[PDB]
Design a protein around this ligand. Structure first.
Ligand SMILES: NC1=NC(=O)/C(=C2\CCNC(=O)c3[nH]c(Cl)c(Cl)c32)N1
Length: 272
């Protein structure tokens, strides 16, 4: 049955995940390219088990596909969809961002991915441009479920309490409340991601009053960067997403109803 078809050559290092190193693997026979996350369990053999477990639950066009996994001694292997376009992080130009239409399309795809995840009761907990990958047609794919967890099971929501994520992207309730709903936390990070795509800079080191840029936002001083670089329509959406009270924060079903979210901006990919 086609010899050598299970042999892959590691041709280059693509990056680093929350729990491992990622290599580009090319099939010896088909030349099919996949990404292989390699994790030396000599650190934590369980954290990686959970990630593999969450990946097995997923199947969506906006989520990095999980092909399988193999354990070789004290080395865990995760075969994942290769996204030749790289990290969204690298499409954001420092202090400028990117064309609004591109940002809107990536945001539409990010939302699609998050709606899907939240739909099966999984929260990512570390949404940031570094973890949002682009395939060859610039389709966005959510990656790295190393910090992901189940927040709804048997139709019962479980409140979270683990401080998790990346400070610039984390919701303020993680810093001031002991327990919190999972979903608004992911919405918030998507909000910070939109700000980065549209302004090329993160608004604050963290969402605490001790942080001046953050109090400035709560005061509505949008005449300052990064907000002044953002057009009124998407800024209006950001005023709904970046709300301190998680209960008053806009939900995804409503983001989908937002004026900017539905504004025709981007033409489809050019055709011959
Ligand atoms: N953060 C992260 N988790 C992953 O599984 C992951 C992958 C694996 C998913 N596919 C990729 O093409 C990829 N490119 C780069 Cl750069 C990284 Cl790193 C990856 N990146």
């Amino acid at each position: 049955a086609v010899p050598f078809v299970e042999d892959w050559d590691l041709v280059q290092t693509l990056g680093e995940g929350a729990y491992g190193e990622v290599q580009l693997a090319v099939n010896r026979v088909t030349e099919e390219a996949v990404a292989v996350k390699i994790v030396d369990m000599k650190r934590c053999p369980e954290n990686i088990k959970k990630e593999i477990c969450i990946n097995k639950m997923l199947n969506h066009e906006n989520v990095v596909k999980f092909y399988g996994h193999r354990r070789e001694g004290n080395i865990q292997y995760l075969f994942l969809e290769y996204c030749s376009g790289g990290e969204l992080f690298d499409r954001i130009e420092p202090d400028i961002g990117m064309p609004e239409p591109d940002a809107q399309r990536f945001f539409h795809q990010l939302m699609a991915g998050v709606v899907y995840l939240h739909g099966i009761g999984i929260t990512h907990r570390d949404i940031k441009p570094e973890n949002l990958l682009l395939d060859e047609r610039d389709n966005l794919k959510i990656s790295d479920f190393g910090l992901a967890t189940v927040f709804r099971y048997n139709n019962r929501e479980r409140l979270l309490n683990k401080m998790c994520g990346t400070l610039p992207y984390v919701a303020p309730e993680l810093l001031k409340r002991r327990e919190f709903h999972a979903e608004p936390v992911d919405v918030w990070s998507c909000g910070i991601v939109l700000t980065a795509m549209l302004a090329g800079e993160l608004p604050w080191d963290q969402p605490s009053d001790s942080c001046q840029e953050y109090s400035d936002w709560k005061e509505k001083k949008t005449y300052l960067n990064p907000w002044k670089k953002i057009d009124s329509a998407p800024l209006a959406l950001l005023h709904k997403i970046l709300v301190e009270n998680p209960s008053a924060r806009i939900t995804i079903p409503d983001i989908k109803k937002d004026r900017w979210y539905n504004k025709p901006l981007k033409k489809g990919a050019k055709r011959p």
